[PDB]
Coordinates of C-alpha atoms in Angstrom, one line a residue:
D1 CA 180.7 -52.4 89.5
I2 CA 177.4 -54.1 90.6
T3 CA 177.5 -57.3 92.9
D4 CA 175.9 -58.7 90.0
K5 CA 179.4 -58.6 88.9
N6 CA 178.9 -56.7 84.8
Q7 CA 181.0 -54.2 86.0
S8 CA 182.6 -53.5 82.0
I9 CA 180.9 -50.4 80.7
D10 CA 180.3 -52.7 77.5
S11 CA 179.6 -55.6 79.1
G12 CA 176.3 -54.4 80.6
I13 CA 175.5 -53.5 77.1
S14 CA 176.7 -56.0 74.8
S15 CA 175.8 -58.0 77.1
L16 CA 172.2 -56.9 78.1
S17 CA 169.1 -59.2 76.9
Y18 CA 166.2 -58.0 74.8
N19 CA 164.3 -58.6 71.3
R20 CA 165.2 -55.5 68.8
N21 CA 161.8 -56.2 66.8
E22 CA 159.6 -55.7 70.4
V23 CA 161.3 -53.6 72.2
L24 CA 160.0 -51.5 70.8
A25 CA 156.3 -52.3 69.4
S26 CA 153.5 -50.7 69.5
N27 CA 150.7 -53.6 68.9
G28 CA 147.8 -51.3 67.5
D29 CA 144.3 -52.2 68.0
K30 CA 142.4 -55.7 68.0
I31 CA 138.6 -55.8 66.6
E32 CA 136.8 -58.5 66.2
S33 CA 133.5 -57.9 64.6
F34 CA 131.5 -55.9 62.5
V35 CA 129.0 -56.7 59.7
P36 CA 130.2 -56.9 56.3
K37 CA 128.1 -54.5 54.6
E38 CA 124.1 -52.6 54.9
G39 CA 121.9 -50.4 53.7
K40 CA 120.6 -46.4 54.8
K41 CA 118.3 -44.0 54.2
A42 CA 119.3 -40.7 54.7
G43 CA 117.2 -38.1 52.3
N44 CA 117.0 -38.7 49.3
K45 CA 119.1 -41.1 49.1
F46 CA 120.3 -45.1 49.7
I47 CA 123.6 -45.2 51.4
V48 CA 126.1 -48.8 51.0
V49 CA 128.4 -49.6 53.5
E50 CA 130.6 -52.5 53.0
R51 CA 133.3 -54.1 55.4
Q52 CA 136.8 -55.6 54.9
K53 CA 139.0 -56.3 57.6
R54 CA 142.8 -55.0 57.0
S55 CA 145.7 -55.6 58.8
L56 CA 148.3 -52.3 57.4
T57 CA 152.0 -53.3 59.6
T58 CA 154.9 -51.6 59.3
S59 CA 158.0 -50.9 60.8
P60 CA 159.4 -47.5 60.8
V61 CA 163.0 -46.1 61.6
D62 CA 162.4 -42.0 60.6
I63 CA 160.1 -41.4 64.2
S64 CA 158.9 -37.7 63.9
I65 CA 159.5 -35.8 67.7
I66 CA 156.1 -34.3 68.6
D67 CA 156.8 -30.5 70.2
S68 CA 158.0 -29.7 66.3
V69 CA 158.9 -25.6 66.9
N70 CA 159.9 -27.4 70.2
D71 CA 160.7 -30.6 72.2
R72 CA 164.3 -31.1 71.3
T73 CA 165.9 -34.2 70.8
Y74 CA 169.3 -34.4 68.8
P75 CA 172.7 -36.5 67.3
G76 CA 173.3 -38.0 71.0
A77 CA 170.6 -37.7 72.7
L78 CA 170.7 -41.1 74.8
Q79 CA 167.2 -42.6 75.0
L80 CA 166.1 -45.8 76.7
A81 CA 164.2 -48.0 74.3
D82 CA 160.3 -48.3 76.4
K83 CA 156.9 -47.1 75.9
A84 CA 156.6 -43.7 76.3
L85 CA 159.6 -43.3 73.7
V86 CA 157.0 -44.4 71.2
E87 CA 154.7 -41.6 72.5
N88 CA 157.3 -39.2 71.8
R89 CA 158.2 -38.5 75.1
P90 CA 161.4 -40.9 75.5
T91 CA 162.8 -40.9 78.7
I92 CA 166.3 -39.2 78.4
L93 CA 169.9 -40.5 79.4
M94 CA 172.4 -37.7 81.3
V95 CA 176.1 -39.1 81.9
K96 CA 179.1 -37.4 81.1
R97 CA 179.3 -36.8 77.2
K98 CA 182.6 -38.4 75.2
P99 CA 182.8 -35.5 71.6
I100 CA 181.4 -36.8 69.0
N101 CA 181.3 -35.7 65.5
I102 CA 178.6 -34.5 63.6
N103 CA 177.2 -34.2 59.7
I104 CA 174.7 -32.3 57.9
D105 CA 173.6 -33.7 54.5
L106 CA 173.3 -30.2 53.2
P107 CA 174.2 -30.2 49.8
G108 CA 177.8 -29.3 48.0
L109 CA 179.8 -30.0 51.4
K110 CA 180.8 -33.3 51.1
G111 CA 184.3 -33.1 52.6
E112 CA 184.2 -30.1 55.2
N113 CA 180.3 -30.7 56.1
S114 CA 180.9 -31.8 59.8
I115 CA 182.8 -31.1 63.5
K116 CA 183.3 -31.9 66.5
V117 CA 180.9 -31.4 69.4
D118 CA 183.3 -32.0 73.0
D119 CA 180.3 -31.9 74.9
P120 CA 177.6 -33.7 72.5
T121 CA 174.6 -31.5 74.4
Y122 CA 171.3 -29.7 73.1
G123 CA 172.9 -26.1 73.0
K124 CA 176.1 -28.1 72.4
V125 CA 174.6 -29.4 69.5
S126 CA 172.2 -26.6 68.1
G127 CA 174.4 -24.4 68.6
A128 CA 177.5 -26.5 66.4
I129 CA 174.8 -27.1 64.0
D130 CA 174.5 -23.1 63.5
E131 CA 178.2 -22.8 63.0
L132 CA 177.7 -25.3 60.6
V133 CA 174.7 -24.1 58.7
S134 CA 175.8 -20.5 58.5
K135 CA 179.2 -21.9 57.1
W136 CA 177.2 -22.9 54.7
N137 CA 175.7 -19.7 53.8
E138 CA 179.1 -18.5 53.8
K139 CA 180.7 -20.8 51.2
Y140 CA 177.5 -20.0 49.7
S141 CA 176.2 -16.6 50.3
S142 CA 174.8 -15.2 47.0
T143 CA 171.5 -18.1 47.6
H144 CA 169.6 -17.3 50.4
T145 CA 166.9 -20.4 49.6
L146 CA 166.8 -23.4 48.1
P147 CA 164.0 -26.4 47.6
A148 CA 163.2 -28.2 50.8
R149 CA 162.8 -32.4 49.6
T150 CA 159.1 -32.8 49.6
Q151 CA 158.4 -36.5 50.6
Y152 CA 154.4 -37.6 50.3
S153 CA 152.0 -39.6 52.1
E154 CA 148.6 -39.7 51.5
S155 CA 146.0 -42.1 53.3
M156 CA 141.6 -42.0 53.7
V157 CA 141.2 -42.3 57.5
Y158 CA 139.1 -45.4 58.8
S159 CA 140.9 -44.8 62.5
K160 CA 143.2 -43.0 64.6
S161 CA 144.9 -46.8 64.9
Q162 CA 145.3 -46.1 60.8
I163 CA 146.2 -42.9 60.1
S164 CA 148.5 -43.2 62.7
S165 CA 150.5 -46.3 60.6
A166 CA 150.0 -44.8 57.9
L167 CA 151.3 -41.4 57.3
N168 CA 153.4 -42.1 60.6
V169 CA 152.7 -39.8 62.7
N170 CA 150.9 -39.8 66.8
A171 CA 147.5 -39.7 66.6
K172 CA 146.9 -37.3 69.0
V173 CA 148.6 -34.3 66.8
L174 CA 146.4 -35.1 63.8
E175 CA 143.1 -35.1 66.0
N176 CA 143.8 -31.1 67.2
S177 CA 146.0 -29.4 63.8
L178 CA 143.4 -31.3 62.0
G179 CA 141.1 -32.1 64.0
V180 CA 139.6 -35.3 62.5
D181 CA 135.8 -36.3 63.7
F182 CA 136.9 -40.6 63.2
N183 CA 133.4 -41.7 64.6
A184 CA 132.0 -39.9 61.6
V185 CA 134.5 -41.8 58.6
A186 CA 133.8 -44.7 61.3
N187 CA 130.3 -44.4 60.2
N188 CA 131.0 -43.4 56.9
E189 CA 129.2 -40.5 57.2
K190 CA 132.6 -38.1 56.6
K191 CA 134.8 -38.9 54.5
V192 CA 138.3 -37.9 55.2
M193 CA 141.9 -38.4 53.2
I194 CA 144.4 -36.3 54.8
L195 CA 147.9 -34.8 53.4
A196 CA 151.5 -35.7 54.5
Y197 CA 153.7 -32.3 53.2
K198 CA 156.7 -33.6 54.8
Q199 CA 158.8 -31.1 54.1
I200 CA 163.0 -31.1 54.5
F201 CA 165.4 -29.0 54.4
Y202 CA 168.6 -31.0 56.3
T203 CA 170.2 -33.7 58.8
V204 CA 171.9 -33.9 61.3
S205 CA 173.6 -37.4 61.0
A206 CA 175.2 -38.1 64.7
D207 CA 178.9 -40.7 63.5
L208 CA 178.1 -44.4 64.8
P209 CA 180.3 -45.1 67.9
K210 CA 182.6 -48.8 67.2
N211 CA 181.6 -49.0 71.1
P212 CA 179.5 -47.6 73.5
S213 CA 182.3 -46.5 75.6
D214 CA 183.0 -44.6 73.9
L215 CA 180.4 -42.0 74.3
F216 CA 180.2 -42.1 78.3
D217 CA 183.3 -40.8 80.2
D218 CA 185.2 -43.4 81.7
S219 CA 184.3 -42.0 84.8
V220 CA 180.4 -43.3 83.8
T221 CA 180.3 -46.8 84.6
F222 CA 177.6 -49.0 83.3
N223 CA 176.0 -49.8 86.6
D224 CA 175.2 -46.0 86.8
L225 CA 173.6 -46.5 83.5
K226 CA 171.4 -49.6 85.1
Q227 CA 170.8 -46.8 87.3
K228 CA 169.8 -44.2 85.2
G229 CA 167.0 -46.1 84.2
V230 CA 168.5 -49.4 81.5
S231 CA 166.9 -52.5 81.3
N232 CA 166.3 -55.7 78.7
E233 CA 163.7 -53.6 78.8
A234 CA 165.2 -50.2 78.6
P235 CA 168.0 -50.9 76.3
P236 CA 169.7 -47.5 75.6
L237 CA 169.3 -46.2 72.2
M238 CA 171.4 -42.7 70.1
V239 CA 170.1 -40.6 68.4
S240 CA 171.9 -41.4 65.0
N241 CA 169.7 -39.5 63.1
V242 CA 168.2 -35.8 62.7
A243 CA 166.1 -34.5 59.7
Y244 CA 165.3 -30.7 60.5
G245 CA 162.2 -29.0 58.5
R246 CA 158.5 -28.6 58.8
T247 CA 155.1 -30.4 57.4
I248 CA 152.0 -29.2 55.4
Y249 CA 148.9 -31.4 56.5
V250 CA 145.9 -31.4 54.4
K251 CA 142.7 -32.4 55.2
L252 CA 139.9 -33.3 52.6
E253 CA 136.6 -34.0 54.0
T254 CA 133.2 -34.3 53.0
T255 CA 130.2 -35.8 53.9
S256 CA 128.8 -37.6 50.4
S257 CA 129.7 -41.3 50.2
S258 CA 129.4 -41.5 46.1
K259 CA 132.0 -43.7 45.4
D260 CA 133.8 -41.8 43.1
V261 CA 134.7 -39.8 46.6
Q262 CA 138.4 -40.9 47.0
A263 CA 138.7 -41.0 43.1
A264 CA 137.2 -37.1 42.5
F265 CA 139.9 -36.0 45.7
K266 CA 143.2 -37.9 43.5
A267 CA 141.7 -35.6 41.0
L268 CA 141.3 -32.6 42.7
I269 CA 145.4 -33.3 43.9
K270 CA 147.0 -34.1 40.8
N271 CA 144.4 -31.2 39.4
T272 CA 143.4 -34.1 36.4
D273 CA 140.9 -31.9 34.2
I274 CA 138.7 -35.2 34.8
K275 CA 138.5 -32.7 38.0
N276 CA 135.6 -30.8 36.2
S277 CA 133.2 -33.2 36.0
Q278 CA 129.7 -32.7 36.4
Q279 CA 129.6 -35.0 38.9
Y280 CA 133.2 -34.1 40.9
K281 CA 130.9 -30.8 40.7
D282 CA 128.8 -31.7 43.5
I283 CA 131.1 -34.2 45.2
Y284 CA 132.6 -31.0 46.1
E285 CA 130.8 -29.2 47.4
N286 CA 129.9 -31.1 50.1
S287 CA 134.1 -30.7 51.1
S288 CA 135.7 -28.7 53.4
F289 CA 140.0 -28.4 52.7
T290 CA 141.7 -27.9 55.9
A291 CA 146.0 -26.8 55.6
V292 CA 147.8 -26.2 58.3
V293 CA 152.1 -26.2 58.7
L294 CA 153.8 -27.5 61.1
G295 CA 157.8 -27.7 62.0
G296 CA 158.8 -24.1 62.7
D297 CA 159.3 -20.3 60.5
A298 CA 155.0 -20.3 60.8
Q299 CA 152.7 -18.6 62.9
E300 CA 151.6 -21.5 65.7
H301 CA 148.0 -22.8 65.3
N302 CA 147.5 -20.9 61.8
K303 CA 145.0 -23.3 59.7
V304 CA 142.9 -23.5 56.6
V305 CA 140.0 -24.1 55.6
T306 CA 138.5 -23.6 51.9
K307 CA 136.3 -25.3 49.8
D308 CA 138.4 -23.7 46.6
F309 CA 141.2 -26.1 46.6
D310 CA 143.5 -23.4 44.9
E311 CA 143.7 -22.0 48.4
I312 CA 145.2 -25.6 49.8
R313 CA 147.6 -25.1 46.7
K314 CA 149.6 -21.9 47.6
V315 CA 149.9 -23.2 51.0
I316 CA 152.2 -26.0 50.4
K317 CA 154.2 -24.3 47.4
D318 CA 154.9 -21.4 49.1
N319 CA 156.3 -23.9 51.9
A320 CA 159.0 -25.5 49.2
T321 CA 161.7 -22.4 49.6
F322 CA 164.1 -23.2 52.8
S323 CA 165.7 -20.2 53.7
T324 CA 169.1 -21.1 55.0
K325 CA 169.1 -18.1 57.6
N326 CA 165.4 -18.8 59.3
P327 CA 166.0 -21.3 61.6
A328 CA 164.9 -25.2 60.8
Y329 CA 163.4 -27.0 63.4
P330 CA 163.4 -31.0 64.3
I331 CA 161.1 -33.0 63.2
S332 CA 162.4 -36.5 62.8
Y333 CA 164.6 -38.7 63.5
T334 CA 166.6 -42.0 63.9
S335 CA 167.6 -43.8 67.0
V336 CA 169.9 -47.2 67.4
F337 CA 170.7 -50.1 69.7
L338 CA 174.1 -49.4 71.6
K339 CA 174.8 -52.8 72.1
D340 CA 174.0 -54.0 68.2
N341 CA 174.6 -50.8 67.1
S342 CA 171.6 -51.6 65.1
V343 CA 168.6 -49.3 63.4
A344 CA 166.2 -48.8 66.0
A345 CA 162.4 -49.5 64.4
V346 CA 159.4 -49.1 66.3
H347 CA 156.4 -52.2 64.8
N348 CA 153.3 -50.9 64.0
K349 CA 150.6 -53.8 63.7
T350 CA 146.9 -53.3 63.8
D351 CA 143.9 -54.2 62.4
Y352 CA 140.9 -52.4 60.8
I353 CA 137.6 -52.2 58.8
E354 CA 137.3 -50.2 55.9
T355 CA 134.5 -48.3 55.3
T356 CA 133.6 -48.8 51.1
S357 CA 130.6 -47.3 49.9
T358 CA 127.8 -46.0 47.0
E359 CA 124.9 -43.8 47.2
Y360 CA 121.7 -44.4 45.4
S361 CA 119.3 -41.4 44.1
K362 CA 115.5 -41.8 44.4
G363 CA 113.0 -41.5 41.5
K364 CA 109.4 -41.4 39.7
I365 CA 107.7 -43.3 37.4
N366 CA 105.2 -41.4 34.6
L367 CA 102.2 -43.0 32.8
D368 CA 101.1 -41.2 30.2
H369 CA 98.3 -43.0 28.5
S370 CA 97.1 -41.1 25.4
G371 CA 95.8 -44.1 23.1
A372 CA 93.0 -44.5 21.4
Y373 CA 91.9 -47.9 23.0
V374 CA 91.9 -49.1 26.5
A375 CA 94.9 -50.7 28.4
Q376 CA 96.4 -51.8 32.1
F377 CA 99.8 -51.4 33.2
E378 CA 101.8 -54.2 35.0
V379 CA 104.8 -52.3 36.8
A380 CA 107.4 -54.4 39.7
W381 CA 110.4 -53.9 41.2
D382 CA 112.3 -55.0 44.5
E383 CA 113.7 -53.5 47.4
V384 CA 116.7 -54.2 48.5
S385 CA 117.5 -54.7 51.8
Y386 CA 121.2 -56.5 53.6
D387 CA 120.7 -58.9 56.3
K388 CA 123.0 -59.7 59.7
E389 CA 125.0 -62.1 56.9
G390 CA 125.3 -58.7 54.6
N391 CA 123.9 -60.5 52.1
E392 CA 121.0 -58.4 49.9
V393 CA 117.7 -59.8 50.4
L394 CA 114.7 -59.1 47.7
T395 CA 112.2 -57.5 48.9
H396 CA 110.0 -57.9 45.5
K397 CA 107.0 -54.7 45.5
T398 CA 104.3 -54.5 42.6
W399 CA 102.3 -51.3 41.6
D400 CA 98.5 -51.7 43.6
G401 CA 97.0 -50.3 39.5
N402 CA 98.1 -53.2 37.5
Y403 CA 95.9 -55.1 35.7
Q404 CA 93.7 -52.8 35.6
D405 CA 91.8 -50.8 32.5
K406 CA 92.9 -46.8 32.0
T407 CA 91.6 -45.0 28.9
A408 CA 91.8 -41.9 26.6
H409 CA 94.8 -40.0 28.9
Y410 CA 95.4 -41.7 32.4
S411 CA 97.8 -40.4 35.0
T412 CA 100.0 -41.2 37.8
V413 CA 103.4 -41.6 39.0
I414 CA 105.1 -44.3 41.2
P415 CA 107.2 -43.3 44.0
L416 CA 110.1 -45.1 43.9
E417 CA 112.6 -45.9 46.7
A418 CA 116.6 -45.4 45.9
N419 CA 116.5 -49.2 46.8
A420 CA 114.3 -50.2 43.7
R421 CA 116.1 -52.7 41.4
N422 CA 114.7 -55.0 38.7
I423 CA 112.2 -52.2 37.2
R424 CA 110.1 -53.0 34.9
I425 CA 107.4 -51.8 33.2
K426 CA 104.8 -52.8 30.7
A427 CA 101.5 -51.5 28.8
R428 CA 99.3 -54.1 27.0
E429 CA 97.0 -52.5 24.6
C430 CA 93.8 -54.2 25.5
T431 CA 92.4 -56.1 22.3
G432 CA 91.7 -59.6 23.2
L433 CA 90.5 -62.4 25.4
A434 CA 92.6 -61.3 28.8
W435 CA 95.9 -59.9 30.3
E436 CA 98.4 -62.7 29.1
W437 CA 96.5 -62.7 25.4
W438 CA 96.8 -58.5 24.7
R439 CA 99.5 -57.3 22.6
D440 CA 102.5 -55.4 24.4
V441 CA 102.3 -51.6 23.9
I442 CA 105.9 -51.3 26.1
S443 CA 107.6 -53.5 27.6
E444 CA 111.1 -52.7 29.1
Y445 CA 113.3 -55.2 31.4
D446 CA 115.8 -54.2 34.4
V447 CA 115.2 -49.9 34.0
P448 CA 117.7 -47.6 35.9
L449 CA 116.5 -46.3 38.6
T450 CA 117.1 -42.4 36.6
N451 CA 115.8 -38.9 38.4
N452 CA 113.1 -40.1 36.4
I453 CA 111.6 -42.6 34.1
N454 CA 108.6 -41.4 32.5
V455 CA 106.9 -43.9 30.6
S456 CA 104.8 -42.4 27.1
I457 CA 102.4 -44.1 25.1
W458 CA 100.0 -43.5 22.4
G459 CA 98.1 -44.2 19.3
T460 CA 95.9 -46.4 17.5
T461 CA 94.2 -50.1 19.1
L462 CA 95.9 -50.8 15.8
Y463 CA 98.9 -48.8 15.1
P464 CA 100.6 -48.3 18.7
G465 CA 103.2 -45.9 19.8
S466 CA 105.3 -45.8 23.0
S467 CA 108.5 -44.5 23.9
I468 CA 110.5 -43.9 27.5
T469 CA 113.2 -41.3 28.1
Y470 CA 115.1 -41.0 31.3
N471 CA 116.6 -38.4 33.9

């Protein structure tokens, strides 16, 4: 009973100012610059990046607990709604607890899947569930293993702050357990795709209280709570739900930049007969598949890393079976504002860059003048580069051998850089007054920058011959 006159328990709370749609918000990073496009030389290739702005906004209900085989949050715990909570390290409230009812979502129990907890508390709650669980085993004695509810999530990685909203997990976690090299994808060197195999066995639901005062014991006056920490910035919450099980986390990382990564990757995953593409096969060489299992009942720090995805597969699947006997650890939960008893949701909002790319393979041109006459060639193309605006800039370049007699069997190669475009070859036979007045023995326009563009002419002044193969 404070002099502030907000003495009644149900009064303090119900009369507590705040905005649910904020008190639990995680306004991400605030980026404001980059460059719409960029090419880059790295080995016998030409990299083309593109920088688009993206804004992934999400409002989660399903919050992931940090210390999987460890930290303990449960149906009843009362946690203030502050930033600590968001970082999976929520402050906690401990006052005298009046009885409550638990209920597990386990199958074939609708009607008898509910116990009471005379003294809401971890050990208490846990044990209860324990007894609850077993009781099931009893009703289902010829079954020791039942499938687990798998929830799939998946996405490439552009930022901690990005993958962190997409998959809905503390970014730190991934950065340690899966070991992410952000700055490598941030520079489009590495391309990462993370897998989210949330294994579910069941949950536990704490029956909603008609009123707050129905939780704390009468001896608990709202003012002790205003004291425990509550405020317009600490609206207490009750864990309305907890889901138990684990989570398989695969990481598909690579060094390529061939636009067909997410492609190859997905093809690989879904294991579609397209994954036998020679191109894919190459993108696969430069890729490492790491898969770990968090949550519980699984040798901590365990981990896999195979170039053969088949190995990642056995992992996942062999983690579907959910033993009813062995302990199931907490991995997800959903609290509720006492006051309005509405579901408490987090506000992840952030802008990030969407890297996009393609790779170009170098090539050279070989000329074969096994001709019974004299000829001059004219090879010209454009080298591409990108300005600060992300615009193409066509630098026109020509072979210094252009406009020059070449006799019975000549030989030369013309090294073209992987950023070569508008490639046109053209051999003109020298029967006439001058260049623009000779007959064309070959003239291919916009030739493709193949491994090798070989132009070979042959023939008689009168009866010329020519061809051009590609690799």
